[PDB]
Design a protein around this ligand. Sequence first.
Ligand SMILES: *O[C@H]1[C@H](O)[C@@H](N)[C@@H](O[C@H]2[C@H](O[C@@H]3O[C@H](CO)[C@@H](O[C@H]4O[C@@H](CN)[C@@H](O)[C@H](O)[C@H]4N)[C@H]3O)[C@@H](O)[C@H](N)C[C@@H]2N)O[C@@H]1CO
Ligand SMILES: [Mg+2]
Ligand SMILES: [Mg+2]
Ligand SMILES: [Mg+2]
Ligand SMILES: [Mg+2]
Lengths: 84, 103, 211, 72, 129, 122, 88, 220
Amino acid sequence: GFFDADLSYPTVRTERMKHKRRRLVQGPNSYFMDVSCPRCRQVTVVYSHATTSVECKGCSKKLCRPTGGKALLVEGCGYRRKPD
Amino acid sequence: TTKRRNHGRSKPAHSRGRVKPIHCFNCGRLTPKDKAVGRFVVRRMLDAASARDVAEASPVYGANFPMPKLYMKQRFCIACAIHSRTVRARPVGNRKIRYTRKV
Amino acid sequence: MTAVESGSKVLRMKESDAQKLLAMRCHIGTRNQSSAMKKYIYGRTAEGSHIIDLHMMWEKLILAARVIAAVENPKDVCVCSSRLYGTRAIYKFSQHVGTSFHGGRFIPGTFTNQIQKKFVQPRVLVVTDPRTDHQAIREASLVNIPVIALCDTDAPLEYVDIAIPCNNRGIKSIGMMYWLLAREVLRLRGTIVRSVPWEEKVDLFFYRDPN
Amino acid sequence: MTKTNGQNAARKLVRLRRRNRWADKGWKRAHTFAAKKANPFGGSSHAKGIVLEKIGVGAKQPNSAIRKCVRV
Amino acid sequence: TMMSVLANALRTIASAERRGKRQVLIRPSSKVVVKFLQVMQKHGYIGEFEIIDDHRAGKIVVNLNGRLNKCGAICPRFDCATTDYEKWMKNILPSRQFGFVVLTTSLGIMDHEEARSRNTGGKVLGFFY
Amino acid sequence: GKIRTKTVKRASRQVVEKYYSKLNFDFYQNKRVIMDVTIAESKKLKNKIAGYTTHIMKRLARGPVRGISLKLQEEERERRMDHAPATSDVDKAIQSGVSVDKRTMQMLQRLEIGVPRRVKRA
Amino acid sequence: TIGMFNEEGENVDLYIPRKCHATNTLIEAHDHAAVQISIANVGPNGVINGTTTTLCIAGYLRSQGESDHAINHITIDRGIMRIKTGKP
Amino acid sequence: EWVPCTKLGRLVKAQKVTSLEEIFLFSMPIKEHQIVDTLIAEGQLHDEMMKIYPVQKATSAGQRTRFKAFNVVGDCDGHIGIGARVGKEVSLAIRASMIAAKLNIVPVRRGYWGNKIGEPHTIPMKVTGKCGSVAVRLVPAPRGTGIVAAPVPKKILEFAGVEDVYTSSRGKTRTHGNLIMATFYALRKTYGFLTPDLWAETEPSRDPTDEHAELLAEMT
RNA sequence: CACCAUGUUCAA
RNA sequence: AAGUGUGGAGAUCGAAGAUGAUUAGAGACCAUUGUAGUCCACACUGCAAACGAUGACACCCAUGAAUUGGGGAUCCUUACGUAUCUUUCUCAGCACGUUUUCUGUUUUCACGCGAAAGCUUUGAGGUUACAGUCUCAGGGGGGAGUAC
Ligand SMILES: *O[C@H]1[C@H](O)[C@@H](N)[C@@H](O[C@H]2[C@H](O[C@@H]3O[C@H](CO)[C@@H](O[C@H]4O[C@@H](CN)[C@@H](O)[C@H](O)[C@H]4N)[C@H]3O)[C@@H](O)[C@H](N)C[C@@H]2N)O[C@@H]1CO
Ligand SMILES: [Mg+2]
Ligand SMILES: [Mg+2]
Ligand SMILES: [Mg+2]
Ligand SMILES: [Mg+2]
C-alpha cells in the first residue's frame, strides 16, 4: 500500500495481469521461437500459437501440434524464444 | 409484491426455459423439479425397540453387521410440504436462510 | 507518520521496537481479508494467515499518536473496547495518557442522548475493534467524532479515519499495541525521553481472567 | 426507453403524436363527430322541448329521496 | 453500438467525478473530445490530461481536481443563433453567473461566452459547470 | 414463595452494599438487621428482603455478583491484580528468540532497519 | 478573497464553509459525520510544537469506507507520513 | 433557568460562541433549542405554524389519535428551520414543533440573477429538493419578480430571506407534509453546490470545543 | 384431512 | 398445452359420460371406471402468468464466497510464493491446489435510485444538475378486446 494507482503509468503487477486488449495499449501475447528438429537438426521458426502443423523443411517431419492455446512442440526438440 | 426473489423456484431468468415436472410424493400434483421441495430420507426399517427383537432372532444381524434401511428421495408439492410440516412458513427476515446440507 | 518538518529520523521504527512487535505476534493477521485493509498486507504465509507490513503498521501507529498528543484536555479522547481482551489495556492506556475510557457494553445513546447522565462528548474516539465496537463508531458518525481503530485484516472501515493495522485478537498482541501507543504519546508530549527505555512493564496491559 | 432524438427525426415525432392524441378523451371528443351527432342538443346549449310526462327518479345510495323531473 | 463518442466521454467524466475519483480513462477519443477538454482546462474545471497513442483511436487519462459538477452533451447538436444564447443559458445552466455551454462554430469549438463576444453562432455540443 | 419483585431485589442489594459486614448466611439474624436498616411498613416485604439478601450472601462467598457495587472487595482485588514481575513477558520473549516465519523473515530483509537481533527463522 | 462579492467588493454571503481535503466537496452544515483531524507538527527532538496540521473530511467519504484511504493520500502529500521504507 | 448539557450550549451560554454561523461552519448538531434564540436576536426571529393535521392509529377498541404539527422558523436573512412533532393534544404538538424547528435551523445561500448591486435577491443557482414524491425546484428570478410559488413554499421562502424566485413542483403537492420538507431540502442545498467563487483554498480553523477545551473542563 | 351454508338499508 | 384434418398406435393417465359416496342439494371435490385425447407421421392453428409481469444495441459502475466452458503461469515502486494421488492405454494422460484473465448463469454487498416493496457492474443507478441510438405500447374505472 501507500502508493496510489496512476492510470497513465500503471504498476507492472497490475498491468501484467490484464487481458491483452484490456491493457493501456493493447498488444500480442504470442512470440516466435527457433525450434531445432529432433533428428535432422536444422532450425525452424515456429509461432507459439501455431494452429497449423509446421513441418521441418529439411527433416520432412512435423515438429509442432496445435492445441486450444499455445501449440505443443514435439518431444526431444530444443527451442529458445526469439525477441521482439 | 414479489414475495421472494427467485419466485419460489431454483430457476433464474436466463438459464432454463422450463424444467419437466415430477409428480408430488403423496398428492401426485405435477410441480417442476426445481420448485418442489426435495428431501432424501435415510429412514430405518425398524424402530430401535423393534430392531432389537429382530437382531436377537437373527443369525446375520448384530452389532457387527448393521441392518438395512430405506433410501427413497421424496419430492413434495408446496401445498403438500406445508401440510405435512416438512417445510413451514418463516418470518420475512428469516426466509433467506438456506441449508446446504442435512442438519 | 514518521516524517517531521525538519527531516529528522526521530520517530522512525527501531530494531528494538520492531523486535517487540514480532515477539507479541501483533503483525499476524487473520485468515480472511477485506478490500480496505488489503493495502496493509505484505503477503500471506503458509497455513493461510496474512502478514502485515511493519512499515505501514508503524506509520499508522505514529499517525494516531500525533493526533492524540495534539489534544489539550486529554479527557476528550475516549478509548473503548467491547471485546473482553481489551478492557485491561484500555484502563492502563487511560492511566498513563490521561484519557477517558469505557469497557463492556457501550450503552447506546452515550454520544447522542443528551439528557442521559452518562452523556460524554469526546473529540477523538479510539476503538479496539471496528467490528465489536460497531456501536461506538456508529454514534461517532452522528456527532462529529473521528475514529482511531486497531484493525485486523478483515475490518469494516466505514467511518474509521485512522485505521491502525495490527493483530487485535490475542491477549498479548492487544495491549502491546496499547503499550506502544501509550509509550509513544508520552514521548510526543515530552513526559518521557526517547533515549532511555520506558521502565513501565507491558504485563499490566494484558487481560487476566480473574476467576 | 421512451422517445427518439435525431436531427432528421421529425416525421417520426409528428406521426407519433398525432396517433397518441386520439387517446386523449378531450382531444378525441373535440375532433370526432359522434360527439355532436349523439349529443341530444345539437352540439349547442339550451335546447327547447315539449314536456311529455312527469317522473320521480329515486336518489342513489346513500341518499334517499325521489327527484322531481320531467321527460321532454 | 457507440453512436456519439463525445457523449460517451462526457458521461464517463461526469460519472467518475460524482464518485469523487482522481483520474478517468476515456475511450475512445477524438479531435472533438480533446477540444472539448481544452475548453474545460482553460476555465479550470479539469487538470492536465494525457492522450495515449494507439494506432487506433486514442485513450485519454484526465486528472480531475474536484471542481466539475456536471459535464454533459446535448444530442442532437442543435443549431444556435446569436439571439439564442440567453435561451440556452436558462435551460441547461444552473445560473447566469457560472457554467458554460460549449458550441462548435465556424471560428472553432468555443464556450457560449466567447462566442457571444465574437458575434458568432454554432451548433451546441455540450456543457460543463 | 415465587419470584421476588424488583422492589424486593433492588432494596436487597442496597442492604448488601451499606451493611455487608453485619450480615451472614442465616435468615433469622439478617431479618433483625433489616428491620433496623430499612424503614418500610410491611413485614411481608422485610421477610422477602431478608430472604434475597441471604441468597446473595451465599453468592458472595462463591464469587462476584453482578450489580453488587461492593467497592472494597473491588478496591482490594484491583490492588492485588496490578502486580507485575520484574522481568517483562516481552523481555523473556526476546531472550529465547522471536522465531519468525518464512514470509515474515522475507519481509524483514526489506526494512530500513534490517532484520533485528535475537531473531530466528523456524 | 473567497465567496461572492457585491460589485462594491464587500463579502456578501454569510459563512464561507469548509471543503473536504480529499474530494474538494463543500461541507454542509448538517453533515454530522464530517470531522476535522488535527495532526501535531513535531520538532527535531520528537516533541510536539504549538502548531498542528488540520485536515477535514466530508461525511459521505467516511460513510463508504474510503476515508482511511484518503487520510493516507493527504498525509503523504503534506509530508506527514512516509510512503515506503528506506533502502536497507 | 436553563442549565445546558452539551458543550456547544455551555459555550453559547458563556458567550464564547458568539454567532450562529460559527456552529454552521463546524457542522455541529445543535441538540438544544436554547442555543438558537440566544444567538439570534429575539425580535428578529419569526415563527408560525404551517399545518396541523391528525394521524390515527387503529387499535383494539377504536382509534388512537395524535396531531402532527408543522412549524417553520427563521429570520428573513438566510436562516430557516422546519420541525415536525406529534402529540395527543393539539397544544402540545404545536409547542413541540417550535422546539423542533429551531434545532433544524440551517443557512440559505443567496445570490444574484444578473449584475450584483446590493443584498442578494435570489438563490445563486437552480436547486431542487425531494421528499417523498414531492420535489420542488427553485430557479433564480430577475430583480423585481417576487416569489412565484404555491402559498406553502411561499411562506417558507419568505422566512428564508429569498426575495425573488421561480418555483416548480413535480408531484402530489396536496400532501403538505412532504411539500414543506422539500422546500426545506432545496434551500438547504444552496450551500452544497461548489461555485467558482468558492474554488479558492481557505485556511483551516479550530473547533469551538477544540479552542475552549480548558474552559469547558472548568464546568466539571 | 367426515360435515360446517348464510347474516336486510343508511348511519354511529 | 389444448384443438383440427388424414393415416398409425392405443400401455398408462384420462375432458365428455356412467356408476358409488358425501351433501339440505352435489350437476363438484373423494372412490371405481371410461370416450375424445395423451404418443408418432404429415398438414393446419398461432389464442399462454409465451414471466424477470422488466424491448433491443453501446457506455460508466464498489465488495466478498462461489459456479460453468476456454486459455495462460507453478510525492504515488524497475518487477518475483506452488502442494496433493491415480497412472498398461480415445495416455507426452486424468482430477486437484494457488493465482491470472475472457465468456456465460447467479448469490450476500458500496454509491445512488424509488411512493414503497425493492433494484444495484445481472440497474429499476449514472434523471427537474431532465438530450448515446432506435423501437413498441399507455393516458381515470368501465362498456370491451364488445359491435361493424
Ligand atoms: O474471467 C474471470 C475474470 O477474469 C476474473 N476477474 C474472475 O474474478 C475473480 C475470481 O473469481 C473466480 O473464482 C472462481 C473459482 O471459485 C474462478 O473461476 C475459475 O476457477 C478456476 C479453477 N477451475 C479456473 O480453472 C477457471 O477457469 C475459472 N473460471 C474465478 O473466475 C476469484 O478467484 C479471484 N479471487 C478474484 C477475481 N476477481 O472471474 C471471471 C469469471 O468469473
Ligand atoms: Mg415457460
Ligand atoms: Mg340467500
Ligand atoms: Mg367425501
Ligand atoms: Mg382409470
